[PDB]
Design a protein around this ligand. Structure first.
Ligand SMILES: [Ca+2]
Ligand SMILES: [Ca+2]
Ligand SMILES: [Ca+2]
Ligand SMILES: [Ca+2]
Ligand SMILES: [Ca+2]
Ligand SMILES: [Ca+2]
Ligand SMILES: [Ca+2]
Ligand SMILES: [Ca+2]
Ligand SMILES: [Ca+2]
Ligand SMILES: [Ca+2]
Ligand SMILES: [Ca+2]
Ligand SMILES: [Ca+2]
Ligand SMILES: [Ca+2]
Ligand SMILES: [Ca+2]
Ligand SMILES: [Ca+2]
Ligand SMILES: [Ca+2]
Ligand SMILES: [Ca+2]
Ligand SMILES: [Ca+2]
Lengths: 284, 283, 284, 283
């Protein structure tokens, strides 16, 4: 009768080597053949306990067989393991505003999945518990883009990859913020400034009137004020002070008509301009 | 604005410790809280890379959050990993014949499952490509016993475990052989032993007639001959020789009537007894 | 000609297994024999690169040989490695006061050294850079006790162990504090209290006089006041307040003579009693 | 009282990270400062056990200190470890003959030393039990070349490195064979070939006389015969047969005078030429 199948009782992967221990018929030949045509053979020690280390072969595939001194073969023991942990990332083309920060205004961002072994057949993406199938593109790259817009907020996202044997590895999570929201800001003459004949006609006797900038979101990275006088527009950086965001022209204006607006941009590259405000300076 | 969520870029488990590296807002507090209510806090270095090691918590469960110098808190990063590789084995109580060779005559053997974490939600046993769900006994031990007898043959078996979070680990396989089959053997007088008048009457004039033992399966581990004389049965060990299995009485037989059968036992502990053979010694 | 010696080009120890890779004559038999009589043999693959894992044998000792298909042996390659990191600790018998804290008043504390493999032949102890030979006692335990008293202070201590092959491992450090110092404390009548006919005769008209406890070191764990009146002594726990350490008897004393002292104990179990103070209460 | 010194109870290096566990005053700040000026701070958990991972710093150098909520600082715990295992190898420039077999005719071979950390203060080469100190060339590469020729034989060699702190690592050994020896070979006319009148005159009547090649060391890898005729030398490859090494001219020789010698080269690249043999063909 041929020897009984060898038994693998321990395995570990340490630095691209598979380390194994098991049992097999004392004195027989243990034959390990990998997916790459490599063969490693050893003599099972007298107590029938063996140990071995082999380089990790393509797709984690190898088979172990016992052969006795007279050429009889055991049942083979096919093994198919997996070692690579998959990675998921926000595509740079779906990463708006500042690049690299995992914040974007793309409500249907594309995710790219990497570090997959060549026998991976199933790739799924978990978005806050909802699981979706990933797609493989023309270049053989796995990716996922939501079919409907994601609402604004912060999403915990990971990828799960399995091979044909059903080995499954789960990525580290990433945290992606969808931010497609920015309040339209507003510019107005500050409290004392709309004076003279009225508190609401936007006609002021101040040649250097002070403006309040309101509805400026906390995640704003840039605040500018646009001033158009006689068909010519100049842009100024807003002041952020103890009083909030304000604008005062850096020199006195001639009497005349000024159209102002304020523009805000946030981290995701959202951009809004205020309704315009038509002011008249009248100091004489 | 609160700080952005911290990022874990690397993890590994080395002797009961989870080792992590990541990024986070420079100078912020990174707070790690595990399922056991432990809290590990660290200050993120100026270059924004952090590293840490924590004891593996119950169920692989912990969350990481960033808090700034003003007490504003980031979105949390929940982790739920699994480290234990499950083990499956043939129950000693289902391992017939030679012990510990994964060969049994039990057609519904019990497999014992071990090394599972408390948050496991799927325990599956793959038998030659078909998965069945494992069961838990009243003591809390996971096992699988097939509901219907297995056919004789070779069975590659593994167990797969998954937690609630979806992490999955696959055992090393075992190879179990079901062997409930054993050919009924045959005892006869060997060539030249059924002598005297007729070659077919089973009357011999030899006082130590040689018998041939036939139809002995290759996995037989024990061969005995049962000799009944004067109503009483004696058991003898057969001898395997250059001509195969035979039996010659160890001392001379008296004239009279004998009844013989051979019994074989295979490595799985199956046993078969031949038809009986009535011989007369007439010397 | 016999095969050339096999070459080991990689080794690592992972969980009681020695993992090895190297080169040797293609198709030859590689024979690994350990210190415990164990033999592990394998066939060198066709490219002449081999890998193996063996249980760590006694004293990290094994030899590797090549044998060709016709029985000729190479030069052997003897290996002798070491895996255990030595440990040093303060002996519990040299650990005064609170046990377990590495603080002691023993200026010649004994250190115990452990986790040494059986082939270790040299054991040295490094105390803030000064290196000393350890000794082995009757039970075969390595230890070190300083020959002269160590001055008070904090010492960074480690152990270095080597085997016969000259492999050397260095322990983690320990930090041991020698504290054999405690100021003798003093008890005195507080500012207003030595009154009546004099500010320095220790005769007071206060029936519940207040005492100051001075020269109490910061590392004191216990402060008590001893009061002897008519040959009978009672002990009280001192008060630590906004004013420091003080004592006031919890009820009025009869007129008469009181002898007081204060006793301090520190973490190392150092213990000092003040000079006694003879006070007289006279309220009539 | 400042807090007591923190304690490191466990360390290990796993892919460029130092992994540590220890104890320290509960709720205190543990500050780790490395040789590169990085600082990693953590809050010690309520149960007083801390764990951490840091990138391996230049020279394995870092210190750990405890600071309490009031800014009092413990005694520091300086660590200085070493992770790199040194490597030694035979310089290709000193590896004669067959390349990469650690066998050479160079009696003062150069060994190249690699994988040393910047704080190394001892670099030693052990040759069959005697240590010599290694040298550093002007480019900064450590090496050892013996000052006096090595005798022929087998040399087990390893390198040992130590830092200023006293940490020591030992390389895997190499086995180098010095072989500068090769027996001078011999060419003669084989049995029956020195024929005709005298068996000793080296006049043959064979136009393709067979020659025996003798005193060929077992480690010979190349055997050639130099045939000089009419003042010009031709080189032939000898043939190793069932009778050993021989040479028969590949085509018939004209009557006249020939001069022969055999040249052997061994695996180490040593070469020897035999004495010349003058033969006359007279057919
Ligand atoms: Ca695979
Ligand atoms: Ca972005
Ligand atoms: Ca926004
Ligand atoms: Ca107005
Ligand atoms: Ca889990
Ligand atoms: Ca069995
Ligand atoms: Ca099937
Ligand atoms: Ca059977
Ligand atoms: Ca008959
Ligand atoms: Ca050793
Ligand atoms: Ca103590
Ligand atoms: Ca003290
Ligand atoms: Ca007085
Ligand atoms: Ca160092
Ligand atoms: Ca060479
Ligand atoms: Ca020597
Ligand atoms: Ca030679
Ligand atoms: Ca002649």
């Amino acid at each position: 009768t041929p020897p009984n199948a060898p038994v693998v009782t321990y395995s570990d992967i340490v630095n691209d080597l598979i380390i194994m221990q098991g049992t097999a018929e004392a004195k027989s030949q243990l034959i390990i053949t990998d997916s790459e045509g490599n063969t490693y053979t050893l003599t099972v020690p007298d107590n029938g306990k063996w140990s071995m280390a082999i380089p990790y072969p393509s797709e984690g595939k190898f088979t172990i067989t016992s052969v006795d001194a007279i050429g009889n073969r055991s049942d083979d023991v096919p093994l198919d393991i997996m070692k690579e942990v998959p990675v998921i990332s926000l595509s740079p083309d779906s990463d708006s505003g500042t690049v690299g920060d995992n914040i974007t205004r793309d409500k249907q961002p594309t995710f790219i999945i990497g570090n997959l072994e060549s026998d991976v057949v199933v790739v799924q993406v978990d978005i806050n518990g909802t699981v979706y199938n990933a797609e493989k593109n023309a270049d053989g790259v796995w990716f996922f883009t939501p079919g409907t817009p994601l609402a604004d907020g912060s999403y915990t996202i990971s990828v799960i990859a399995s091979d044909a044997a059903g080995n499954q590895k789960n990525s580290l999570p990433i945290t992606v913020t969808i931010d497609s929201t920015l309040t339209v800001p507003e510019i107005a003459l500050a409290a004392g400034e709309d004076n003279g004949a009225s508190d609401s006609d936007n006609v002021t006797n101040h040649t250097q009137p002070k403006f309040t900038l309101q509805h400026i979101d906390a995640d704003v990275t840039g605040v500018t004020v646009n001033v158009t006088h006689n068909g010519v527009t100049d842009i100024y950086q807003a002041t952020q002070g103890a009083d909030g965001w304000t604008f005062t022209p850096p020199a006195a204006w001639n009497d005349g008509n000024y159209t102002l607006s304020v523009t805000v941009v946030d981290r995701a590259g959202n951009s809004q301009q205020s309704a315009s405000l038509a002011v008249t300076v009248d100091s004489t």
